[PDB]
């Protein structure tokens, strides 16, 4: 385990790698909002269908 950990290690500050979480969340928020609007449109279509009958 330690062998692979040292082999795949990069010389760089650690506080910068963890900072990538902010970028990952900012990039996933777009897909999250897309899924939100998609499910909202789906629910609207479902309620319209139930109203038409």
């Amino acid at each position: 385990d330690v062998d692979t950990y040292l082999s795949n290690l990069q010389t760089k500050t650690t506080l910068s790698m963890i900072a990538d979480g902010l970028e990952r969340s900012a990039r996933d928020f777009d897909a999250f909002l897309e899924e939100n609007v998609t499910l909202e449109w789906e629910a609207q279509r479902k309620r319209i269908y139930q109203h038409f009958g």
């Binding site: 650690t14 969340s25 909002l33």
Partner: protein, 1641 residues
């Protein structure tokens, strides 16, 4: 029950390093420097408080005695030990010491191998670097030098190792002697006003060792007076070893160097023993000593020839002179001439001890010893021989008058009948004042000035015997200039003008000075005579007044003696002028006295000094005058007359040049003493003003004494300084000293004169101070000028620094020009000092120290603040910076060679226990050099300097500073600070490899030396310094040094080994050092995680438990409880701990082992929930109150003017933002800063700084907790411990939203919080919604968000766009979570009514950045219109949605991302039936058919994957937004709008063709379903009427075949381009297909 548990700890600790032996080297330094921290440390406290150490120091003969300790040695050496045992056995066999002492010395040498190796000659690389830096400075030996490999291979040899062990043994003996001497000195003559801890330790040591209790009226002096023989007997063995080296020692080691070292060590031990004996004797001055010991000591001295046999060599003169002086001192002490003569004449017993006068054998021995000493021809026996001659003369006089036991002595040696021998001895001693000269030399070597060989108290107590001898030899010896000069050189000791301080000391030290006024003899023989012989004999009276004023500054009982003697002089004495022969007449009263009285009205200096007629006088054969006057006024008048270049034949003679210099010097000293005593409590603030007014009395009204000094300077500087005699240079130095003195009470006139002094870059007139440069010889006559000028300049700069105020007659421009001239002069002096040849090194050392201190005070004062207060010296600071950072390539080395030479001389200087003045001067010089280097480094780092040519030289200077600490431990913290500054400069600028300049062996030695963070003492300042140095070295690109410091060559004895030991005891360790330890840990983790985290996981059982303990018992609000300043420290420690835990959890998650650790740590977030994201502890009320109180009392100076310029690392204490170190002296000039009972502005400023540090620590903890919770949200993905997690997240979000509304912090001090703490809650809510674990409690969470949105000033398009965007995303996620959950409609309609509409209108008006904001607003509205509570409030929200008429602006913006967003906005608006029909009204079709987009729509280029961007954009806008809107508007009413949709379809068939042709053997399936529904509804409508729906323009067969052929191969053309962060679409596809089948089939 007195063991060596603490004296000689177990060998296991000494080898492993867990407890370094408190060797005498460290103890001697602590007792010599009188350091508070070291002397009050736990280790040294326990070491000294032990009874074993007391018994050892009370019997040093036992420490190194020969005895059979084989049992103890074998028991200690049992339970690299073989080599230690072999070395100990060899040393015990060679020297007669015991085996335990040999083992201890060997262990100490083993622990101190780093120093022994660093004090060795440098390698060839260092020599080459020094030769390259040099381009004087040749004191190093470059010829003799070898490489590092050959030096290390020879270091590990056997002969060299044994030689070093013997050298360390001698050094430890010297250190033990010096330490016991300093301990006895501090215990007997302890100074007052010391720290309570020091007094407590002193009393404890006394009560434990000698039972000397101060509370007892009569302490037990027995154990204190019994220490004299203990050392007088050891002196025998000392001289025996000096005259004969060990016989069993190998002959190969008995070399010239070893013999010289042994001789020097023996001389030092003898000197220390003599000093301890003198102290034990003078402890009881009035009583006599036991004659049984004095007889033995005199016999030993007679046998040894007063140590002249061992001191006869010419190579130990430096150590022989002080040895002889101390021998003479102890001899005169034991003789006790003062009490001896009293006992002889008065015949009164002392009642304290039997004197040696009752034993004729002792007298015979003393006489024969003195005779042998005088016959041998030695100068050391001069004072002792003179004292013995006086004693014998007094005894003979007493015998003749009587003509008891002394008669036997007088008769046995034939001296009864004749007095020839003692008479001849006295004659040959007094001839040419040889005795007086040797006594003056001894006093100089036993004085208080820096030239003395011992401490100030040692010399003060040693001068007592000489003063008593002169007192008892004053009555017999007539008054003469020789004894007067002798007493002057003894008392004053040629002290410097700046060697006078108001530091209160014990009465013992001041006894030597008060004796002059206490005893009637020294008062009526020297004081009265010196006063009478004035100004005739000006030097004696001047030196007497000077020393008395310097000594009686704090003595309030005799503080007005000098002033009285100067203002009311009783008599006058001046030379007689032949012109006055006709202005006097003899009264014929007494011919022997030669009395007379003035007959004419003599007018001197013809208000003015006038003498009345009828004054009596005495001709001393010059004449004495008995008239009361103020000698100060007459001296000032004489100085004025001499400076005016006017001579009066009918007046008194002018003062001599030397006399004028001494007069000005004594005046300056008196003025300085007055100014120093006036500031002290109990004095008068008008002392210096009154003194100056009296000095300027009966003088010309136009000028004063300052003008006299100005004229004298102008006269002396008229010609070039090169052609000036010694007396003139001394007069100039005295004038500079007087200007320095007057600078305190009258800065205005001093500055006004310096503005036109014409001495420092004044004009082109010859006489400038910069013309004294070159390759000249600066002897004592020429050195006293610059040594005073530099200090005068430093004082001028210090006075100018106080620009917040006496100053009548000055201006900003004048002070700026004077400061620039002073800086130019100082720079010229610093550049020229590299060529002068001084008689000694101490002069150049003091000069370098002074100039470096001046430059440092100039540099720091410029960048310490950024307000206008530091503008007076700003030009000088800028000039100095531009000259010391970017000098020309021709004169670059001239400014660097001085520092290199200083470092060389400091690192090549031999360590000696004597001459403490020179030692402290060199230490202060090194400290100033290092501070100036650090200031230059920080200045280069600031202002954005990309090319620093000084770094190339600072590297080679650090090459020497790596070894310099080996000579003195005091250089540890300053050198480490300089290295830290250099590393910081190299960081913000790979850098030059420091290992190439240091060297492998040297670097390893430095690392092994600095790995111990003040182990023997354990102080906080040096500990924090070392931790910051380590952190800075690790943060930089340094890799080799970082590895050698961390690994130690895992780690076994490296820095981390002790860092963990300190971290596992933070519950009791000082919080101040804990911050630095945690900073070092973080700096080693972030850059070297693979090692630190590994070692911590391997030993986490000791760190995780302590972290949990700290977290659980860490209250939130610590200010209310006991402790105010510790709150910031605790917050910083918690922030560092949280950051370290976050990094550890991140590494574990990267290794997939962060589950159990995170689950165990989440239960320790109590302190976080308490005092984490909440930053409301700013307390702006008290800050505003302090600001108002400071602006009301200081209209000119503001509170913000004290803001730091980021020049130094802002300490997290009472000086984080406000500069307190400078304010203490800048505002402490008027009442208001001090305050009663520790009140005023100082305490409020300290509280404000503590609050700012606490806020900074809270922000750091906020960032740490943000990272921790961000990583935990991903780590804690499964369904477990969800309740506590959700509670913590909600509490954090609520605290953040509340802090956003409560009072905000300032933007100029701290960073703007806007957008800094919003994304935190944003991502928290995002992840919690992704997990779907919310309690749908938005009923109250949305109130804070709404209040914030209302009180944000609506920055929709202002510069603060990120804050608006993050607030919009936060409210979006909040309303989405609310939708998942009525009492919510009335709370949520506020955003739909006032927020969304206002923001949309503002965006539409601004757009006339915008795309993303409009899309976010559209998404917000879409997600808000889905709340269940709105499905019933449609009728209620219709009015508030139609009041703004957003449809008009939407359609306007639609008439191309803006059009798409407007279309989506109107679509989401049409989600309601009322709005649906409103939009379906004819208002839509108009613009829908008239929109300009029809131009592109009609074109056949439309398509989903069309190469043209516009075509694809239009296709997407039509497919994703137009069809749902069509379905919505149709749901309301279809029968009426069927013609419209039919026309829209048959008018643009290209879209239908593209939709039905693209799919061949998703958002398009929605289109198919919409078309199917439209076909169904239009057919149902046409079933009744035929006028509408003329053509369906839709095929069913093709669509049927398509849906049949499309119901694994489906993934052929499924490549989602938008969603790429998340089975997904097949479910929706099958649902849409089922819907199509249901509507069509």
């Amino acid at each position: 029950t007195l063991t060596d548990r603490t004296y000689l700890p177990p060998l296991e600790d000494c080898l492993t390093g867990r407890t370094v032996i408190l060797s005498w080297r460290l103890v001697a330094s602590a007792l010599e420097d009188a350091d508070l921290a070291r002397l009050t440390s736990p280790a040294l406290s326990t070491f000294l408080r032990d009874g074993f150490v007391h018994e050892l120091l009370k019997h040093p003969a036992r420490v190194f005695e020969p005895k059979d300790l084989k049992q103890e040695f074998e028991t200690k050496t049992s339970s690299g030990v073989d080599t230690i045992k072999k070395d100990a056995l060899w040393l015990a066999d060679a020297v007669a010491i015991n085996q335990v002492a040999a083992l201890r010395i060997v262990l100490i040498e083993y622990q101190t191998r780093a120093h022994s190796h660093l004090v060795l000659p440098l390698s060839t690389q260092d020599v080459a670097n020094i030769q390259e830096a040099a381009g004087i400075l040749s004191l190093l030996n470059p010829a003799s030098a070898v490489d590092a490999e050959t030096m290390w291979c020879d270091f590990e040899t056997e002969a060299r190792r044994r030689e070093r062990i013997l050298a360390t043994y001698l050094s430890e003996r010297r250190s033990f002697t010096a330490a016991v001497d300093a301990l006895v000195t501090f215990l007997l003559h302890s100074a007052p006003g010391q720290h309570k801890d020091l007094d407590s330790l002193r009393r404890a040591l006394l009560k434990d060792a000698f039972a000397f209790d101060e509370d007892l009226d009569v302490p037990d002096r027995s154990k204190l007076l019994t220490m004299a023989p203990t050392y007088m007997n050891l002196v025998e063995d000392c001289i025996a070893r000096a005259q004969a080296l060990p016989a069993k020692l190998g002959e190969s080691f008995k070399t010239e160097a070893f013999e010289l070292d042994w001789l020097r060590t023996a001389i030092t031990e003898a000197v220390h023993s003599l000093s301890i004996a003198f102290q034990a004797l003078d402890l009881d001055t009035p009583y006599f000593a036991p004659h049984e010991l004095l007889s033995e000591w005199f016999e030993l001295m007679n046998s040894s020839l007063f140590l002249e046999s061992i001191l006869g060599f010419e190579v130990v003169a430096d150590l022989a002179m002080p040895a002889r002086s101390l021998v003479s001192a102890i001899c005169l002490k034991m003789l006790n001439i003062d009490r001896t003569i009293q006992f002889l004449h008065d015949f009164d017993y002392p009642d304290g001890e039997e004197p040696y006068l009752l034993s004729s054998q002792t007298l015979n021995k003393i006489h024969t010893a003195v005779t042998n000493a005088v016959n041998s021809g030695v100068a050391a026996s001069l004072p002792v021989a003179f004292a013995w001659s006086l004693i014998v003369h007094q005894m003979h006089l007493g015998y003749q008058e009587r003509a008891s036991p002394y008669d036997d002595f007088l008769r046995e040696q034939r001296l009864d009948n004749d007095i020839a021998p003692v008479e001849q001895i006295a004659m040959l001693a007094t001839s040419r004042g040889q005795v007086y000269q040797v006594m003056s030399e001894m006093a100089l070597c036993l004085g208080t000035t820096h030239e003395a060989a011992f401490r100030p108290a040692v010399g003060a107590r040693a001068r007592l015997v000489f003063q008593d001898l002169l007192k008892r030899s004053a009555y017999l010896i007539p008054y003469q200039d020789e004894p007067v000069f002798s007493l002057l050189a003894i008392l004053a000791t040629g002290r410097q003008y700046w060697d006078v301080t108001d530091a209160l000391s014990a009465s013992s030290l001041n006894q030597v000075y008060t004796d002059m006024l206490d005893d009637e003899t020294l008062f009526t023989q020297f004081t009265m005579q010196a006063i009478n012989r004035f100004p005739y004999e000006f030097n004696p009276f001047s030196v007497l007044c000077r020393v008395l004023a310097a000594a009686l500054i704090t003595n309030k009982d005799k503080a007005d003696v000098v002033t009285g003697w100067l203002w009311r002089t009783p008599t006058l004495t001046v030379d007689w002028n032949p012109a006055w022969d006709r202005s006097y007449e003899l009264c014929f009263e007494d011919e022997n006295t030669n009395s007379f009285r003035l007959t004419r009205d003599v007018d001197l200096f013809g208000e003015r000094f006038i003498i009345p007629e009828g004054t009596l006088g005495r001709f001393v054969t010059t004449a004495r005058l008995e008239f009361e006057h103020s000698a100060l006024a007459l001296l000032g008048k004489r100085l004025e007359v001499k400076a005016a270049e006017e001579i009066c034949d009918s007046g008194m003679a002018p003062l001599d040049v030397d006399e004028q210099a001494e007069a000005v010097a004594m005046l300056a000293t008196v003025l300085r003493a007055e100014s120093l005593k006036s500031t002290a409590k109990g004095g008068d603030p008008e002392a210096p003003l009154k003194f100056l007014k009296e000095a300027s009395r009966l003088l010309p009204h136009n000028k004063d004494i300052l003008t006299v000094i100005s004229d004298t300077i102008d006269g002396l500087v008229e010609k070039e300084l090169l052609e000036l005699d010694g007396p003139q240079i001394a007069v100039l130095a005295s004038c500079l000293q007087f200007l320095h003195a007057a600078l305190a009470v009258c800065p205005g006139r001093v500055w006004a004169y310096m503005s036109r002094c014409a001495l420092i870059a004044g004009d082109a007139r010859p006489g400038r101070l910069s013309r004294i440069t070159g390759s000249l010889d600066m002897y004592a006559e020429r050195f006293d000028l610059l040594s005073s000028a530099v200090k005068l300049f430093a004082a001028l700069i210090d006075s100018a620094a106080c620009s917040a105020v006496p100053w009548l007659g000055t201006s900003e421009k004048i002070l700026s020009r004077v400061a620039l001239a002073i800086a130019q002069a100082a720079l010229d002096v610093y550049e020229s000092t590299t060529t002068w040849r001084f008689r000694s090194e101490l002069d150049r050392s003091i000069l370098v120290r002074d100039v470096v201190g001046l430059m440092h005070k100039l540099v720091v004062h410029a960048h310490t603040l950024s307000s206008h207060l530091t503008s007076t010296l700003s030009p000088a600071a800028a000039h100095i910076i531009s000259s010391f950072l970017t000098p020309p390539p021709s004169a670059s080395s001239l400014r660097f060679q001085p520092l290199l030479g200083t470092l060389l001389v400091a690192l090549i200087t031999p360590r000696a226990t004597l001459y403490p003045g020179q030692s402290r001067i060199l230490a202060e010089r090194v400290t100033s050099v290092l501070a100036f280097c650090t200031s230059l480094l920080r200045a280069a780092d600031f202002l954005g300097q990309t090319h620093i040519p000084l770094q190339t030289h600072l590297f080679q200077s650090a090459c020497l500073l790596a070894r310099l600490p080996a000579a003195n431990a005091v250089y540890r913290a300053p050198v480490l600070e300089l290295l830290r500054a250099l590393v910081e400069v190299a960081g913000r600028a790979e850098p030059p490899s420091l290992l190439g300049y240091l060297g492998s062996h040297a670097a390893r030695s430095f690392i092994s030396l600095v790995e111990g963070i003040d182990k023997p003492f354990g102080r906080v300042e040096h500990a924090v310094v070392t931790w910051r140095f380590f952190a800075a070295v690790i943060r930089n690109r340094q890799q080799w040094m970082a590895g050698c410091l961390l690994t130690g060559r895992v780690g076994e004895g490296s820095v981390l080994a002790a860092a963990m030991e300190r971290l596992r005891e933070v519950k009791s360790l000082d919080v101040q050092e804990a911050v630095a330890v945690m900073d070092f840990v973080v700096s080693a983790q972030n850059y070297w995680p693979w090692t630190i985290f590994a070692v911590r996981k391997e030993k986490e059982v000791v760190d995780a438990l302590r972290g949990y303990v700290r977290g659980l018992k860490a209250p939130g609000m610590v200010m209310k409880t006991d402790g105010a300043a510790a709150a910031a420290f605790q917050a910083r420690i918690a922030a560092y701990v949280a950051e370290t835990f976050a990094m550890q959890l991140y590494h574990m998650r990267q290794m997939r082992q962060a589950e159990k650790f995170a689950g165990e740590l989440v239960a320790d977030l109590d302190y976080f929930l308490r005092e984490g994201v909440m930053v409301w502890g700013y307390n702006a009320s008290l800050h505003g109150n302090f600001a108002r109180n400071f602006a009301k009392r200081f209209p000119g100076v503001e509170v913000d003017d004290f803001k730091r310029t980021m020049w130094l690392p802002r300490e997290l204490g009472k000086g984080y933002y406000y500069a307190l170190e400078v304010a203490e002296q800048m505002l402490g000039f008027d009442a208001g800063w001090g305050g009663v009972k520790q009140s005023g502005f100082r305490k409020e400023m300290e509280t404000a700084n503590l609050n700012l540090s606490l806020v900074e620590a809270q922000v750091s903890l906020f960032h740490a907790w943000e990272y921790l919770l961000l990583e935990l949200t991903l780590s804690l993905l499964p369904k477990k411990e969800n309740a506590a997690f959700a509670r913590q997240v909600l509490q954090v979000v609520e605290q953040c939203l509340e802090a956003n509304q409560r009072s905000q912090p300032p933007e100029n001090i701290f960073v703007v919080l806007g957008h800094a703490r919003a994304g935190l809650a944003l991502t928290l809510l995002q992840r919690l919604a992704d997990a779907n674990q919310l309690p749908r409690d938005v009923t109250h969470l949305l109130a804070l968000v709404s209040s914030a949105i209302h009180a944000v000033e609506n920055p929709f398009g202002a510069n603060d766009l990120p804050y608006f965007r993050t607030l919009l995303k936060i409210l979006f996620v909040v309303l989405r979570a609310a939708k998942q959950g009525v009492a919510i409609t009335q709370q949520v309609l506020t955003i739909l009514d006032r927020v969304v509409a206002r923001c949309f209108r503002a965006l539409a008006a601004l757009v006339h950045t915008a795309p993303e904001d409009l899309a976010l607003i559209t998404a917000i509205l879409q997600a808000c219109l889905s709340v269940p509570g709105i499905e019933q409030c449609q009728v209620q929200v219709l009015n508030i949605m139609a009041a703004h008429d957003v449809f008009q602006v939407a359609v306007a913006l639609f008439s191309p991302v803006y059009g798409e967003l407007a279309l989506l906005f109107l679509l989401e608006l049409s989600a309601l039936p009322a709005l649906a029909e409103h939009l379906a009204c004819d208002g839509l079709l108009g613009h829908l058919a008239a929109a300009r987009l029809a131009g592109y729509m009609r074109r056949t280029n439309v398509g989903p994957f069309a190469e043209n961007a516009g075509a694809a954009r239009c296709y997407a806008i039509w497919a994703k937004c137009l069809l749902p809107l069509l379905l919505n508007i149709l749901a309301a009413l279809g029968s009426t709008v069927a013609p419209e949709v039919a026309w829209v379809l048959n008018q643009f068939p290209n879209l239908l063709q593209s939709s039905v042709e693209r799919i061949e053997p998703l958002l398009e399936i929605s289109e198919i379903h919409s078309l199917a529904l439209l076909t169904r509804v239009l057919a149902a409508c046409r079933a009744q009427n035929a006028r509408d729906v003329p053509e369906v323009t839709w095929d069913g067969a093709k669509v049927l075949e398509c849906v049949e052929y499309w119901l694994k191969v489906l993934r052929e053309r499924l490549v989602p381009l938008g969603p790429r962060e998340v089975n997904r679409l097949e479910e929706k596809a099958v649902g849409l297909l089922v819907g199509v089948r249901e509507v069509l089939e």
